[PDB]
Curated annotation (Swiss-Prot), chain D:
Domain of life: Eukaryota
Subunit structure: The 26S proteasome consists of a 20S proteasome core and two 19S regulatory subunits. The 20S proteasome core is composed of 28 subunits that are arranged in four stacked rings, resulting in a barrel-shaped structure. The two end rings are each formed by seven alpha subunits, and the two central rings are each formed by seven beta subunits. The catalytic chamber with the active sites is on the inside of the barrel.
Additional remarks: The side chain of Thr-1 acts as a nucleophile, and the N-terminal amino group acts as a proton acceptor. Present with 11400 molecules/cell in log phase SD medium.
Organism per entry: Saccharomyces cerevisiae (strain ATCC 204508 / S288c)
Protein name: Proteasome subunit beta type-2
UniProtKB/Swiss-Prot annotation, chains E, F:
Active-site residues (renumbered): 1 (nucleophile)
Subunit structure, interactors included: The 26S proteasome consists of a 20S proteasome core and two 19S regulatory subunits. The 20S proteasome core is composed of 28 subunits that are arranged in four stacked rings, resulting in a barrel-shaped structure. The two end rings are each formed by seven alpha subunits, and the two central rings are each formed by seven beta subunits. The catalytic chamber with the active sites is on the inside of the barrel.
Record-level GO cellular component terms: cytosol; nucleus; proteasome complex; proteasome core complex, beta-subunit complex; proteasome storage granule
GO-annotated molecular function: endopeptidase activity; threonine-type endopeptidase activity
Organism expressing this protein natively: Saccharomyces cerevisiae (strain ATCC 204508 / S288c) (Baker's yeast)
Pfam families noted in UniProt: Proteasome
Name of the protein this chain belongs to: Proteasome subunit beta type-1
Gene designation: PRE3
EC number: 3.4.25.1
Curated annotation (Swiss-Prot), chain H:
Subunit structure: The 26S proteasome consists of a 20S proteasome core and two 19S regulatory subunits. The 20S proteasome core is composed of 28 subunits that are arranged in four stacked rings, resulting in a barrel-shaped structure. The two end rings are each formed by seven alpha subunits, and the two central rings are each formed by seven beta subunits. The catalytic chamber with the active sites is on the inside of the barrel. Interacts with CIC1.
Keyword Transmembrane helix annotated: no
Keywords for this protein: Cytoplasm, Nucleus, Proteasome
Organism expressing this protein natively: Saccharomyces cerevisiae (strain ATCC 204508 / S288c)
GO biological process, one term: proteasome assembly
Source organism superkingdom: Eukaryota
Classification lineage: Eukaryota, Fungi, Dikarya, Ascomycota, Saccharomycotina
Disulfide bond positions: none
Annotated function: Non-catalytic component of the proteasome which degrades poly-ubiquitinated proteins in the cytoplasm and in the nucleus. It is essential for the regulated turnover of proteins and for the removal of misfolded proteins. The proteasome is a multicatalytic proteinase complex that is characterized by its ability to cleave peptides with Arg, Phe, Tyr, Leu, and Glu adjacent to the leaving group at neutral or slightly basic pH. It has an ATP-dependent proteolytic activity. PRE3 and PRE4 are necessary for the peptidyl-glutamyl-peptide-hydrolyzing activity.
Localization: Cytoplasm; Nucleus
Protein family membership: Belongs to the peptidase T1B family.
Protein name, per record: Proteasome subunit beta type-7
Curated annotation (Swiss-Prot), chains I, J:
Chief localisation class: cytoplasm
Stated name of the protein: Proteasome subunit beta type-4
Species per Swiss-Prot/TrEMBL record: Saccharomyces cerevisiae (strain ATCC 204508 / S288c) (Baker's yeast)
Localization per record: Cytoplasm; Nucleus
Miscellaneous comment in the UniProt entry for this protein: Present with 21800 molecules/cell in log phase SD medium.
Protein family membership: Belongs to the peptidase T1B family.
Purpose: Non-catalytic component of the proteasome which degrades poly-ubiquitinated proteins in the cytoplasm and in the nucleus. It is essential for the regulated turnover of proteins and for the removal of misfolded proteins. The proteasome is a multicatalytic proteinase complex that is characterized by its ability to cleave peptides with Arg, Phe, Tyr, Leu, and Glu adjacent to the leaving group at neutral or slightly basic pH. It has an ATP-dependent proteolytic activity. This subunit has a chymotrypsin-like activity.
The organism's taxonomic lineage, starting at the top: Eukaryota, Fungi, Dikarya, Ascomycota, Saccharomycotina
Amino acid sequence: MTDRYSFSLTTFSPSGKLGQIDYALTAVKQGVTSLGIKATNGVVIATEKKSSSPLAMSETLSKVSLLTPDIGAVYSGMGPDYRVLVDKSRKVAHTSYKRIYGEYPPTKLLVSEVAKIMQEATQSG
Amino acid sequence: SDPSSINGGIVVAMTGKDCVAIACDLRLGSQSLGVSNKFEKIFHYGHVFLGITGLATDVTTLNEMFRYKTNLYKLKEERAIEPETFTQLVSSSLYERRFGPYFVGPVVAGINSKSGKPFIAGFDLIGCIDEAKDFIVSGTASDQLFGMCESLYEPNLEPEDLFETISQALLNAADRDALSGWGAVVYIIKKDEVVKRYLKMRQD
Amino acid sequence: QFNPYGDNGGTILGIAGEDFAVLAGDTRNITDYSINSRYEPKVFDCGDNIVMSANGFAADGDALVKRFKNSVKWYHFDHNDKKLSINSAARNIQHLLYGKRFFPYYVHTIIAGLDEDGKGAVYSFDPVGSYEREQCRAGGAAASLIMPFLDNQVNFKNQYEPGTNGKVKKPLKYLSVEEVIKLVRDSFTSATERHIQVGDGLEILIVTKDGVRKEFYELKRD
Amino acid sequence: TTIVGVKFNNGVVIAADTRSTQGPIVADKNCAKLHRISPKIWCAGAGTAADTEAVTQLIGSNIELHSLYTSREPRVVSALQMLKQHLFKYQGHIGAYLIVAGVDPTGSHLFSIHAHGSTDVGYYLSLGSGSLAAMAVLESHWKQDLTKEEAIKLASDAIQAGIWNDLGSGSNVDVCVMEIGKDAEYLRNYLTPNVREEKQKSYKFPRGTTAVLKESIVNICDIQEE
Amino acid sequence: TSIMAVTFKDGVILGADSRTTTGAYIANRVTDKLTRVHDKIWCCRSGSAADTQAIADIVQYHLELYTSQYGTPSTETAASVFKELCYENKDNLTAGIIVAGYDDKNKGEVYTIPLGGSVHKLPYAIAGSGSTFIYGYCDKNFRENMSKEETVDFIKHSLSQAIKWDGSSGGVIRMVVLTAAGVERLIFYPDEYEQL
Amino acid sequence: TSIMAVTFKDGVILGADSRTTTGAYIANRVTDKLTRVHDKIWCCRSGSAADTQAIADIVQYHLELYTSQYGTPSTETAASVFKELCYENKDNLTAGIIVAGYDDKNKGEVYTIPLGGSVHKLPYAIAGSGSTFIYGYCDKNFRENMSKEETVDFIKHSLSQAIKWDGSSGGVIRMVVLTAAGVERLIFYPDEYEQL
Amino acid sequence: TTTLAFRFQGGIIVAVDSRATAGNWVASQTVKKVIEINPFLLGTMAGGAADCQFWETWLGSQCRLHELREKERISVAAASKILSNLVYQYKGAGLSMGTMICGYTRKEGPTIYYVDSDGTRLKGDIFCVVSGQTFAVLDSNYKWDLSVEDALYLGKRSILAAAHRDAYSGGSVNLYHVTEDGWIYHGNHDVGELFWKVKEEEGSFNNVIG
Amino acid sequence: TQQPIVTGTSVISMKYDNGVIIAADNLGSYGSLLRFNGVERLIPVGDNTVVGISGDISDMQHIERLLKDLVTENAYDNPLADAEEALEPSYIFEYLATVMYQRRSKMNPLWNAIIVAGVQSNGDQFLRYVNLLGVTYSSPTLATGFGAHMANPLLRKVVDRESDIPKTTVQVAEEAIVNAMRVLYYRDARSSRNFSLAIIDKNTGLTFKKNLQVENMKWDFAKDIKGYGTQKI
Amino acid sequence: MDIILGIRVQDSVILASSKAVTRGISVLKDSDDKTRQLSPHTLMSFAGEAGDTVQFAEYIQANIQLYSIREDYELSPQAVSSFVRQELAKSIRSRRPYQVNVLIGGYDKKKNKPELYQIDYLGTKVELPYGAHGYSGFYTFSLLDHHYRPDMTTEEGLDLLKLCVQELEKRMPMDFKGVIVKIVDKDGIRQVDDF
Amino acid sequence: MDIILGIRVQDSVILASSKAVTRGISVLKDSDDKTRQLSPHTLMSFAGEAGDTVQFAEYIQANIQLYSIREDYELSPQAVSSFVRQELAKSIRSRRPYQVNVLIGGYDKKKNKPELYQIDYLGTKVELPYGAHGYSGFYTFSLLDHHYRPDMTTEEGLDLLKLCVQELEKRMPMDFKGVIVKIVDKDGIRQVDDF
Ligand SMILES: [Mg+2]
Ligand SMILES: [Mg+2]
C-alpha cells in the first residue's frame, strides 16, 4: 500500500495552463447558481436547493453553512468537496486562531485559510 | 536555585481615568551581586505595553517572541494588536510550555484604540490570566507591591496623579526588596500620547 | 516524625509616637486553611506600662508572655517594687529568648511603652533574642504588606517637596495618636484584603503616661 | 476555592466563590471560576487555575466543532467523557478538578471530575479547599424535589460557608442556573457580602512628590509619511 | 471498598458498598461500583477510581465492537479483555476487578483479577479493603447452587460485616442480579443491614 | 499469629496457634503462646517474641511479689501491670497482649492491650496477624454465657479460619480453660480443625 | 552585611552597614552592627545577630569583672580570647559569628582581633566581612600615615562601594574612631544620600545616571 | 516522639445562653480498622466540667487517670472540696494545657486534641481547646479533627459571635450539635453512628447522655444514582 | 576559578583572561588562551565547564566565519552578541546545557564605537562599560565603579585593568597564573605582550 | 590547603609552614605563624580545622611548659612527641575529635641529635628524615627522596627546602602566600628572615 502518488497531478501545460484547475472551474460552472450581496448593515448569501429526488428530505442537506457565529458560506460545484471544506474551515478557525487569540477569526483571514487548503490540493502529491 | 528570584526585579500596572500606567525597576543581578542598572522590563508592540519580571533570559526571549508574533499579526490583520487580544496571545504562548515553562510574571497594560477603555492584565508562569480593574503586581517584591497598591490606590485617578501613586508604590516596595531597585521607569499611557519618566531612588 | 512547631498566623504592629506607643494585632487564630478563633487576644498588658506580643507559634507566644509577666512580678519582689523600665524589660526578654537558643520560641516579639524620659518606645526581637529599639515594626504574616506603607506614610520615604524636583525631602512631622491609629487601621484593612490569615478583628493597646487603654475594630471575616 | 452543584426540579445550579490566591496572598478579589464549555453546559474549577481554564476551553472548542459536525446541541456526557479521557492521559499532571453541570436534549446533568480522570454522579457536589464547609451545609439542608429558588438559596449558602470558614475562599458568590427548555442565566456577583469599608485616610500625593531624572515622549505610532 | 460476586442456581449476583474516600474524607457516600460492560456482563471495581473507570470504559468499547462482528461475548472473553489491559499495564495501574456474567450455555460465572493482572475463575470472589474481615465468614457460609433469596442474604450479611470493620467501606449495599429473567438492581440501606 | 480469649458461663478460654516465623521460614511450628502469669491469670502473646516474653516474665514477678504481700491479685490488676509496662515503654516495644483470668467474685474476664498500651475490657478479644480474617465470623457467632463445649467449638472454628487464610498462623490450636474447677490444657491437631 | 575595621596612625576606624534581610525581604535598614562592649572596646555584628549581641554584651560583663579584680584595663588580646574560648566550647552546636574586636591600649597600641564561630582568633591590621566572606574592599588608597578625617572617609566610601553592588548591604553607614582614651561615634550616614553626594563630588559611579 | 495507634475522631462543642454542650462518638479506630465501639471520650470532672478528647486513646486513658488523681488530690486537707474550693473548669484546663506544652517541649507529646467544656463558680460558660503542641484557643464553637472542617461551619451559623450566645437556647444548641454529628457520620470515614453528648448548664447542672444514635438519615436518593457518567442501568 | 574581565574605554574594548587551566587540585596549563576571534573586529572570551567552553566558542566562530563568507560582510557586535545569546538560551532547556559564560568585545565600524556584551550560560545578556564572570566580578566591580570614566584612553584602561589584576592576585585564594590581554579597536584585534 | 614541611639534616630540624589563612574563597591573613614553641629545643607546626589547630597547639604548649617548671627539666623530643600522640589518640574516640595534623621538630641535648616526628589527627606517629601533611606531601616527597642526604648541612637543607617551595608554588592551584622557616638546633629555635 502506502500513498505512492508523491508527485503533483496538477502540472503546467505548454500553453501555461493548469489543466486540473481549469477542469475544476468547469465542474463549478455545471454547479447550481449561488450568489452573495453586501448591504451597508449586512450581507446575504443564497442558492437553490436542487433536490435530487422528491422522496429526499432537502432540509437535511445544508448548502449554506455556519463557519463561525459571524461567518457563513455557500458554494457552487461538487457538494461532497464543499462539505469536507466546511469541516476543515470550522476546525482551522479554532486551531489556527480561537485557541491562540480567544476570539473568532476575521472574515478575510478565515477565507485566507480556506484558500490555502484549496491551493495545497493544487500542488500537493 | 529558584529561577524566579535569581535576577530579581518588579513590574506594577495601574488603571486611571482614560489612562493606564506601567512601571518597573532597572536592576539585573546574579543573586546578591548587582550586574546592570539599565535592564528595562517594559516593552511595547504598537500601543500595547508588556512588563516581564523573573528569569532575565526568559524576559529577553519572550520580548523577542511577542515582537515576532505581533509583527506577523499586523502584516496579516493589517492593524496593530489590541490589549485584550494580546493578553490571550500571552496566555496561549505561556500554556504551550505547560511542562517546561518560562519563569516569568508578565503584565499587560494599554488602551483599546476603538473603545478607549483602559486595560491591564497579569499572568502566572503558565498563562493563567488575572484581569483586575485596579492594579497588577509582579516580581520579587510582589507582596510589598500588593501592600503599597492596596492602600495607595483609588479609582479614576488623572494621569499626573496616577503617576505619583504608581511611582510611590514601586519605589517604597523596591526599597524593602534586596533584589529590586537600582533605578525605576514609569510609563503614563493615554489614547494617543505616552510619557516615559526615569525616577531618582537610592542605589543600594 | 513529630513537629513541635506550628503557625497560628496573625499580624502585629508596633508604632512609637513622641509621648505615646501603640501595639496592634488582629484577633484571628488559624491553622492551615481553618479558623480556630475570630477573637483570641495576641497583645497583652504585662504591667509597669509595658504591652507585649509574641506572634507566630501561639504556644511558644503564650509561654514567653507568661514567663515575662512572671519576670515582672519577681523583679518587684527582688528590687523593692522598682518599676521595670522598657529598656530593662527588652534586655530581660533577650535572655528569656536566648535561653532557648538551641530550641527556640518560634515567635517574633514586639514590646511597646514609654522610655525613662517619657518618650514612646518600641523594641523588636528575632526568635533567639536579637533586639533593636525602633519607631515602626510590623511582625507576622502580613509584615511585608505593612512595612513598605509605613516607610512611606510615617517616615515620608521617597516623598519630596513639590517644585524642588527631589532636592528637598518632605519634612518629618510628629504624628498624633489619632493619625497613628488611622495608619494602623488602614494597614490592617489593606492586609485583610490581600492576606488570607489576616481578618476578623483588630485590637489596639495605646500606652501613655496615664496608662494602658484598649481599642477594638472589626475586620472582614472572609 | 469553594465550588458547588445542586440538581433541582427542572435543571441544575452551579455556584463558586471569587477569590484566587498565590499561596497566602489574594492575587484577584473578583475572579470568575464559572466557565462555559457550551451555552447550556457550565463548569467550575479548583486546583491549578491555568489547568482548569485550559481544559474547559480545549473541550469547549472540541464540543463546538462536534456540535456543528453532528447538527446536535452538545451533551454533558460528551464534555465529561472528553474531559476525563484527556485528564486520565496526563495522569493527574493537569491539576483540574471540575464540577460539570448542564441541560441538553437528554435532560439535566451534574458530574464532578478529578485531575486523575475519575468522575462521579450526584444531586449535590462540592469541590476545592472550602468543599467540607460547603458539603456540611448541603448535607444539612438538601432534599429531593428542590425548586429553582430553593436550589439557588442552598448553592449560595454552601459557598458562603466556604467564604467565611475557608481561608482559601472569600469575596463574592457567582451562580449559573441551567433550566430545561430555557437559556442558562449566568449571575455574576449574585451576592456581595465582603465590600471593603472606606479607609480612614486619602493617600493621594501632592503633584511633584516623586523625584524624576528624565522625561521623554514614547513613539507608539508607526513610521510617518513625508 | 467491599465488593463480591456469588454464583447461585439461577446465575450470579454482584454486591458492593457505596463509599469512596480521599484519606479519611468520604468524597462520595452513594458511589455505584457495579459497572455494566455488556447487557449481562458486569464488574465490581476496587483500586484507583480513575484506573477502574478507564479500564471498564475500554472493555465496554471492546465488547460493543465484538458484539457488532461476532455476536454476544462469553463472560470468559470479557474477563480475558480485562486481564489483557490489567496485565500489560500492571506498572501504571492500581485496579482489582471482579467480572461476573450470565450466559445461557455456561450460566453464572465469576472471574477475579488481582493487582498483578492474573485471572482466577471462582464459585464466588471477595475483594476491596473490607474483604480481609469476611474471609472467615464467607468461607464458612458459602454453599454452591443457593437460591436467589439465600445468595442475597449471604452477600447482605457478608458486606454488612465488611462495612462494620472497614472505615473505607460504608453507605448503601448495592446488588445486581444476573439471570435468564434479566437484570435486577437491589439497594439495602444502613437501618436494614446494620441490625443483622 | 492468631490468638483469642472468650468469656463463657463458667469462666474464660484462651486460644492460640503454634506458629512462629522469621520471614517465610517457620522458626517454631509447636510454639506455646498461652503463658501463665498467675495460677488462674494467663495471657496470649503477639508481636516481638523477645518483647512479649520479657513483659510476661516481669508481670509474673510483679504478681508473685503482689501475692506474697496482698494475696491473690484480680485479673484487672494483672491487666494494669501489663498496661503499665506496654504504655510507658511504647517507643521500644512491639507487643499485643490479651490478658484472661478467673476470679470467684468477678468470674471470667478478658482484657486486650494493643500496641499503644491502651486497655480494653471485652466479652471476648481476637489479636495477631490472623485475627483480621475472622472479625466477620467472630462477630456473627459469639454469644454471651456459652457452655464450655460451645466456647471450645467457637475458638476451634475461629482459629481454624484464621490459620487457613494467614501464612503467619498454623500448626496446632492450643487452648487453656480457666474455671472454678481449675486449669485445663487442650490441643487440637491439623487433621481435626482443617476438615471443619 | 558589610563590616570594616582597619588600623592607622590615629587608631582604628570601624565602618558597618545597617541592613538586615530575611530571604529577599529587607527586615530592617536601621540595625546597629557595632556593639559597644564598653567605652574602649567595639565589636562588629556578622553571621547570627543574636549570637553577636548576646556574647559581646556578656564579654563587656566579663571585661568589667576583670577590671574590678585586677584594677587594670583589660587588654584587647585578653578580651578577644575570652570570646574566642567561649564560642569554641559551643563549636558544632550552630553558633554563627564573624566579629572584629577593636580596642586601643597603651600596652598594645591599636589592636583588632577577628573572632569566629569556628574558634578562629586572628590579629590583623585590616579585616572586612562582606555577606558571608571575610578578608584582610578596594585596598588601593590605604596607607598607615593617613589623617583621622581621611581614614573616616575611606571607611565610609568602602561601605558605600559594597552597599551599591551587594543586595544584602545598604541602609546607612555607622562610623566609629577608636583612640587610647576610648571610641568616638562619627554618626549615621544614609547610603541613598551618601551615594549621590559621593558620585557628584568624587565623579565616581559614572555608569549610574542621576 | 511516637505515632498514634488507637485513635478517636472529632470532639465538637458550643456555648449557649446558660451553659456549654460537648459531644464525641464512641469509636476507637486502629488505622482503617474500626476496632473498639464502646469507647467513652467525654470524661466528666465533678459536676461542672466535661473534658472531650480526640487522638491517641492510650494517652486519653493516661489523661483520664491524671484528672481522677486531680480530684483525689484537691480533696486532701480541703474542707471546702465540695464547695468554694471545688475544681473549676479553668483550673482543670490550665493543668492539662501545662502538661500538654511540657510534654511537647520534651519532644514526647500526648498525641491528643482536648476540649474542656464547663460552667465556672460565677455561672460563666467555659470552653477552651488544647492539643499535642500545647496550642490553646477559645471560641463560641470549638471542634477537633474533621469537626473543625464540617461541624464548626454549621455551629457558627447558630453562634457566629459572642452576642449570639445569649440568644441561643439549649434546645437549638443541642439540635445543631446532633445535626453536626450526623454530617460527620455521612462524611468522616473514622466516625461511628453511636455517640455521647454532655450538657453543663448553670441551672440544671451536668446532664450526661450515653448510647445516642445518629437518626433521620437521608439515603433513599442513592437508588436513583447509576454508574459514574454514561451508564443508565 | 577562571578570570574573564572586559572594560570598554573611549575607542576600544580590552579583555583580560586568566591563563590557568586547573582540573581538581592539579594545574594542567599556565598559558591557556580563553579567547576566539569571531570576526576581524569581534573577540569572545569564555570561562566554564571543561570541553563545553572550547566546543561552544569554536561552534560560534565557525557560524560567524560562515556568515562572513556567504554575505562578504562583517556582522555588527550587537548582531553577533544576539546570535550567541540565542544559542545559549536554546541550550539551557536542552538535554545537556552548555555551562559556558562569555564576554563579547567588538568595534562597530558603522557606528565607530566600541561595545562590550556580557552573556551567562542561561542566555542573560547586558551591554556594559565593564564586566566580569565568576568570583572575580565581586573583587573587580567595586574598583571599576570608582575609577571608570567613559572617555578613558586605551593606556588608562590598561592601567585600571593592571590595578584590578594586582588586587585579584592578592585577595584570590586560587593562583590563576596571570592574564592574557587583547585590545579590539578600528584597526582590529591585537594581544598586549607586556602585562 | 596549608603546607607544613619538616626536614631533619645532620645537626638541626627545619620546619616550613604556609603563611596563608583562607576560610572558603576569602584569604583572612597572609602572615599567619602555624608554630608553637613547646620547649627551648622543641618546635611544633600544625595544620587542620579552624580553631582546633591553635587550641590544640596552645594546650600542648601549656602542658609541656607546666612539666618544665615542675621538674626544672626539658622533656626529650621523643617524650614530647609520645605525649602529643596520646592526646590525639584520645580525641579520635571523643565526642568531637581535634582535626589537627602536627610536625614536631626538636634537638635532643642528651643524644646531641636532631629528631622530626610526624603525627596525624588519629594519633599516627612516625620519626622521619623529612615529612609533610596534606597535598604538599605528594608534590614534595618525591623531590626529597632524590636529593635528601643524612649528612646534609643546615644551608643544604634550606636550599632543598627552597627548591620544594618553588616547586609547590608552580604546581599548586592554591596561593599559600609563601612559608615561614624555623631552625631547631643545640642553640635553640630561630626564624630564617630570608626566604
Ligand atoms: Mg532595594
Ligand atoms: Mg497456614
